[PDB]
Design an enzyme around this catalytic site. Structure first.
Site, mmCIF file in Angstrom:
data_model
loop_
_atom_site.group_PDB
_atom_site.id
_atom_site.type_symbol
_atom_site.label_atom_id
_atom_site.label_comp_id
_atom_site.label_asym_id
_atom_site.label_seq_id
_atom_site.Cartn_x
_atom_site.Cartn_y
_atom_site.Cartn_z
ATOM 1 C CB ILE A 66 -0.762 0.675 10.265
ATOM 2 C CG1 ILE A 66 -0.642 -0.436 10.973
ATOM 3 C CG2 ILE A 66 -2.023 1.459 10.466
ATOM 4 C CD1 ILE A 66 -0.144 -0.390 12.466
ATOM 5 C CE1 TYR A 80 -0.906 3.111 14.439
ATOM 6 C CE2 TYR A 80 -1.478 4.504 16.480
ATOM 7 C CZ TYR A 80 -1.763 3.357 15.532
ATOM 8 O OH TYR A 80 -3.010 2.339 15.748
ATOM 9 C CG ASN A 124 -7.223 -3.812 9.853
ATOM 10 O OD1 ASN A 124 -6.370 -4.696 9.409
ATOM 11 N ND2 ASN A 124 -7.478 -3.505 10.894
ATOM 12 C CB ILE A 147 -6.274 -5.067 20.034
ATOM 13 C CG1 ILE A 147 -7.173 -3.916 19.648
ATOM 14 C CG2 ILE A 147 -6.756 -6.326 19.470
ATOM 15 C CD1 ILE A 147 -8.300 -3.831 20.966
ATOM 16 C CB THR A 154 -2.445 -7.995 17.306
ATOM 17 O OG1 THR A 154 -1.710 -6.666 17.743
ATOM 18 C CG2 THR A 154 -3.830 -7.729 17.099
ATOM 19 C CD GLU A 155 3.653 -12.784 17.037
ATOM 20 O OE1 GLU A 155 3.114 -13.209 16.192
ATOM 21 O OE2 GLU A 155 4.689 -13.432 17.876
ATOM 22 C CB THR A 156 1.987 -6.418 15.377
ATOM 23 O OG1 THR A 156 2.324 -7.406 14.361
ATOM 24 C CG2 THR A 156 2.819 -5.260 14.922
ATOM 25 C CE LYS A 181 -4.081 3.988 12.270
ATOM 26 N NZ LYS A 181 -4.937 3.544 11.199
ATOM 27 C CG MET A 221 -2.278 -0.973 0.988
ATOM 28 S SD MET A 221 -3.164 -0.624 -0.303
ATOM 29 C CE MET A 221 -4.442 -1.928 -0.087
HETATM 30 N N1 LIG Z 1 -2.791 -3.841 17.589
HETATM 31 C C1 LIG Z 1 -3.414 -2.898 18.427
HETATM 32 O O1 LIG Z 1 -3.239 -2.951 20.097
HETATM 33 C C2 LIG Z 1 -3.872 -1.577 17.905
HETATM 34 C C3 LIG Z 1 -4.347 -0.516 18.853
HETATM 35 C C4 LIG Z 1 -5.117 0.368 18.112
HETATM 36 C C5 LIG Z 1 -5.510 0.595 16.914
HETATM 37 N N2 LIG Z 1 -4.975 -0.594 16.038
HETATM 38 C C6 LIG Z 1 -5.332 -0.539 14.612
HETATM 39 O O2 LIG Z 1 -5.819 -1.723 14.192
HETATM 40 C C7 LIG Z 1 -5.392 -2.118 12.737
HETATM 41 C C8 LIG Z 1 -4.836 -3.492 12.700
HETATM 42 O O3 LIG Z 1 -3.854 -3.544 13.672
HETATM 43 P P1 LIG Z 1 -3.188 -5.036 13.978
HETATM 44 O O4 LIG Z 1 -2.391 -4.956 15.240
HETATM 45 O O5 LIG Z 1 -3.830 -5.992 13.255
HETATM 46 O O6 LIG Z 1 -1.728 -4.837 12.958
HETATM 47 P P2 LIG Z 1 -0.739 -6.071 12.562
HETATM 48 O O7 LIG Z 1 -0.814 -7.082 13.128
HETATM 49 O O8 LIG Z 1 0.748 -5.460 12.216
HETATM 50 O O9 LIG Z 1 -1.295 -6.322 10.922
HETATM 51 C C9 LIG Z 1 -1.181 -5.066 9.909
HETATM 52 C C10 LIG Z 1 -1.450 -5.636 8.672
HETATM 53 O O10 LIG Z 1 -1.256 -4.749 7.638
HETATM 54 C C11 LIG Z 1 -0.376 -5.219 6.538
HETATM 55 N N3 LIG Z 1 0.540 -4.423 6.031
HETATM 56 C C12 LIG Z 1 1.910 -3.652 6.871
HETATM 57 N N4 LIG Z 1 2.266 -3.026 5.917
HETATM 58 C C13 LIG Z 1 1.676 -2.916 4.731
HETATM 59 C C14 LIG Z 1 2.042 -2.437 3.502
HETATM 60 N N5 LIG Z 1 3.089 -1.551 3.407
HETATM 61 N N6 LIG Z 1 1.091 -2.582 2.349
HETATM 62 C C15 LIG Z 1 -0.047 -3.429 2.585
HETATM 63 N N7 LIG Z 1 -0.292 -4.013 3.744
HETATM 64 C C16 LIG Z 1 0.624 -3.791 4.780
HETATM 65 C C17 LIG Z 1 0.199 -6.589 7.277
HETATM 66 O O11 LIG Z 1 0.459 -7.591 6.325
HETATM 67 P P3 LIG Z 1 1.778 -7.652 5.618
HETATM 68 O O12 LIG Z 1 3.021 -7.051 6.667
HETATM 69 O O13 LIG Z 1 1.911 -9.384 5.187
HETATM 70 O O14 LIG Z 1 1.937 -6.864 4.478
HETATM 71 C C18 LIG Z 1 -1.029 -6.842 8.287
HETATM 72 O O15 LIG Z 1 -1.837 -7.887 7.643
HETATM 73 C C19 LIG Z 1 -4.346 -0.840 12.338
HETATM 74 O O16 LIG Z 1 -4.957 -0.048 11.485
HETATM 75 C C20 LIG Z 1 -4.006 -0.167 13.784
HETATM 76 O O17 LIG Z 1 -3.802 1.231 13.577
HETATM 77 C C21 LIG Z 1 -4.121 -1.509 16.458
HETATM 78 C C1 LIG Z 2 2.568 5.233 24.954
HETATM 79 O O1 LIG Z 2 1.781 4.418 25.413
HETATM 80 C C2 LIG Z 2 1.084 3.909 24.598
HETATM 81 C C3 LIG Z 2 1.656 3.511 23.348
HETATM 82 C C4 LIG Z 2 0.684 2.953 22.392
HETATM 83 C C5 LIG Z 2 -0.580 2.394 22.777
HETATM 84 O O2 LIG Z 2 -1.436 1.682 21.818
HETATM 85 C C6 LIG Z 2 -2.139 2.394 21.210
HETATM 86 C C7 LIG Z 2 -3.546 2.129 21.630
HETATM 87 C C8 LIG Z 2 -1.829 4.114 21.038
HETATM 88 C C9 LIG Z 2 -1.963 1.741 19.914
HETATM 89 O O3 LIG Z 2 -2.875 2.062 19.050
HETATM 90 N N1 LIG Z 2 -0.856 1.321 19.465
HETATM 91 C C10 LIG Z 2 -0.797 0.413 18.493
HETATM 92 C C11 LIG Z 2 0.152 0.923 17.501
HETATM 93 C C12 LIG Z 2 1.681 1.127 18.360
HETATM 94 C C13 LIG Z 2 2.168 -0.406 18.454
HETATM 95 C C14 LIG Z 2 1.282 -1.029 19.501
HETATM 96 C C15 LIG Z 2 -0.018 -0.984 18.698
HETATM 97 C C16 LIG Z 2 -0.152 -1.844 17.545
HETATM 98 C C17 LIG Z 2 1.075 -1.216 16.698
HETATM 99 C C18 LIG Z 2 1.206 -1.978 15.536
HETATM 100 N N2 LIG Z 2 -0.012 -2.705 15.137
HETATM 101 O O4 LIG Z 2 1.987 -1.563 14.729
HETATM 102 C C19 LIG Z 2 2.218 -1.059 17.181
HETATM 103 C C20 LIG Z 2 0.384 0.055 16.258
HETATM 104 C C21 LIG Z 2 -0.976 2.790 24.035
HETATM 105 C C22 LIG Z 2 -0.261 3.368 25.049
#
Ligand SMILES: NC(=O)c1ccc[n+]([C@@H]2O[C@H](COP(=O)([O-])OP(=O)(O)OC[C@H]3O[C@@H](n4cnc5c(N)ncnc54)[C@H](OP(=O)(O)O)[C@@H]3O)[C@@H](O)[C@H]2O)c1
Ligand SMILES: COc1ccc(OC(C)(C)C(=O)N[C@@H]2[C@@H]3C[C@@H]4C[C@H]2C[C@@](C(N)=O)(C4)C3)cc1
Ligand SMILES: NC(=O)c1ccc[n+]([C@@H]2O[C@H](COP(=O)([O-])OP(=O)(O)OC[C@H]3O[C@@H](n4cnc5c(N)ncnc54)[C@H](OP(=O)(O)O)[C@@H]3O)[C@@H](O)[C@H]2O)c1
Ligand SMILES: COc1ccc(OC(C)(C)C(=O)N[C@@H]2[C@@H]3C[C@@H]4C[C@H]2C[C@@](C(N)=O)(C4)C3)cc1
Lengths: 264, 264
Positions: free
Chosen positions: B96, B158, B94, B193, B195-197, B162, B68
């Site tokens: 990032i 980030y 979705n 959330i 998630t592993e990342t 957002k 993307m």
């Molecule tokens: N996880 C949290 O605690 C947290 C908190 C608040 C909000 N969110 C939001 O929730 C959404 C999903 O988070 P997540 O935790 O599921 O993240 P994630 O596990 O890292 O998944 C991100 C997805 O985006 C894809 N991606 C990364 N770089 C890309 C690129 N350059 N082009 C196309 N696809 C790409 C990845 O697949 P590939 O790397 O294989 O391309 C992966 O499927 C995000 O938008 C984030 O802002 C997450």
């Molecule tokens: C400074 O204290 C805090 C920092 C961050 C905090 O989580 C948020 C609610 C802001 C958030 O959305 N974090 C995301 C963001 C940063 C990191 C963890 C999470 C997944 C992420 C990713 N999937 O790449 C990697 C993208 C809370 C509190």
């Protein structure tokens, strides 16, 4: 409480200061006897702002011309301006790319350029200015809009960039706070101001009161010098008493201990 | 009130669905017997998500792989996905770019790429998807964060992207409202959330509760289908009852008649 003396001899940068709110700020600073470097693209209108700045009693006044689309220029400018004034006390970030009220259709080129100019160059300029600003325990002043706190139709790309500014700058404020980087950050939220660019753009579409260009400029300078985190300035006081978000300040605090910075 | 039937036979796009919240959503949709096109960069993990989608009883399931960062790809993808499903009912945005918790120093490259991927491609994808979405009176679902409503340290770039999302999409919602473009826009504000990342990135820095990846995914899908303007999802309910901003909704309304759209 504010006093004009506070700016005496200070070294200040104003961007997009060839006209409107920018130019007004340069004049205020000139009157307070500050050192002033102004910038925009048009070197004719910039020469004129410098002359009047010297007239009003500025400690010094210079301009450097160039587009803020060009990220190399934004970096070089700050350095050159620093050498001109021998240091930097305040960075007033004011410029925006040509924008008008329109429904969004498929103008991606505009959305992009808006982020590039209204937001990204503000970052580039901050990065460049920070060493000098740490030195003087200075200030960054970021000019935003009501459109950068609440949503308006017809200014989508603009609003996005002004929202991004809040996100970025409100974020690095928290970083600076715990890093004991002693540079203050003022986000100025402005309603309609009677600049010409504004009045033309909203004519026949938007209706309401515009606040005067001159007073607005001072209110900004006031807020930065008093190191306020935010300045709100609009015709309606009902706005100024509703635009505030105490919920967010509370949340940002309840969360404030739930991470641990010590590692950095 | 919500019912799983609402997704039966619907044609849905999920971005960044190779893992985490993305992948979970694709599975929920598969269970509701929807048509699903998923995307990310990694075609191995994408094949796998497709297989399990077919297993869970999706009406159909396909993937298209690519980055993307590439705005041409974002445009072409939506078109190809549309042909695959013969139309489009929901666009779940979705993905990032790779990000981690760090103080901001001079990493402009990251700030840029963040806007390019987290924000700008969301727009590109919306532009492409809109004709089909007008056709089906569909929905756009935009995945944001608490970092996209309040400021956090260490996620500056980030947070900026957002915040931009709120500004742009909250703005075009108002445009669509009066243009009688009948496409709903859901902004999902998420807290931590599991998630592993996420868990990896916050480990040792942030501390608090993570909400489960699976429940979060459904809450999103729920909000989009019920055409809610915002979904709030966090471990703390104190958050969900403080993250709201009724002041803004009031201001956006008091202003709502002070311009006049009829000209468009
Ligand atoms: N996880 C949290 O605690 C947290 C908190 C608040 C909000 N969110 C939001 O929730 C959404 C999903 O988070 P997540 O935790 O599921 O993240 P994630 O596990 O890292 O998944 C991100 C997805 O985006 C894809 N991606 C990364 N770089 C890309 C690129 N350059 N082009 C196309 N696809 C790409 C990845 O697949 P590939 O790397 O294989 O391309 C992966 O499927 C995000 O938008 C984030 O802002 C997450
Ligand atoms: C400074 O204290 C805090 C920092 C961050 C905090 O989580 C948020 C609610 C802001 C958030 O959305 N974090 C995301 C963001 C940063 C990191 C963890 C999470 C997944 C992420 C990713 N999937 O790449 C990697 C993208 C809370 C509190
Ligand atoms: N005016 C309002 O009612 C209103 C309301 C709320 C907030 N604001 C905010 O207030 C600030 C100033 O507004 P204003 O009304 O004074 O605007 P303005 O009159 O149009 O002035 C903008 C300045 O930016 C410069 N500029 C434009 N494009 C540039 C580029 N590509 N590179 C470098 N400089 C560029 C212009 O100089 P050149 O064109 O010669 O380069 C000009 O000096 C803006 O940040 C705006 O967001 C304005
Ligand atoms: C839809 O109803 C409204 C639209 C816009 C409204 O003014 C705002 C407070 C959002 C604002 O900041 N406007 C700015 C913006 C757009 C236009 C007028 C002003 C100067 C500007 C410029 N200098 O280029 C040109 C940049 C109020 C109400």
């Amino acid at each position: 409480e504010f006093r004009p003396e506070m700016l005496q001899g200070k070294k200040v940068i104003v961007t997009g200061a060839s006209k409107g709110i920018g130019r007004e700020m340069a004049y205020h600073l000139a009157k307070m006897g500050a050192h002033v470097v102004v910038t925009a693209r048009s070197k004719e209108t910039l020469q004129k702002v410098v002359s009047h700045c010297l007239e009003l009693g500025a400690a010094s006044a210079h301009y450097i011309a160039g587009t803020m689309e060009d990220m190399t220029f934004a970096e070089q400018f700050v350095a050159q301006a620093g050498k001109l004034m021998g240091g930097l006390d305040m960075l007033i970030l004011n410029h925006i790319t040509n924008t008008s009220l329109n429904l969004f259709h498929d103008d991606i080129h505009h959305v992009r350029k808006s982020m590039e100019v209204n937001f990204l160059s503000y970052v580039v300029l901050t990065v460049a200015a920070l060493p000098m600003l740490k030195q003087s325990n200075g200030s960054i002043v970021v000019v935003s809009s009501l459109a950068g706190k609440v949503a308006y139709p017809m200014v989508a790309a603009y609003s996005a960039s002004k929202f991004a500014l809040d996100g970025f700058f409100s974020s690095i404020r928290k970083e600076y706070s715990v890093s004991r980087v002693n540079v203050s950050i003022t986000l100025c939220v402005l309603g309609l101001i009677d600049t010409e660019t504004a009045m033309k753009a909203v004519s026949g579409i938007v209706h309401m009161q515009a606040a005067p260009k001159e007073e607005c400029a001072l209110e900004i300078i006031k807020g930065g010098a008093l190191r306020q985190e935010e300045v709100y300035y609009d015709s309606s006081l009902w706005t100024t008493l509703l635009i505030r978000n105490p919920s967010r300040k509370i949340l940002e605090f309840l969360y404030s201990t739930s991470y641990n910075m010590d590692r950095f």
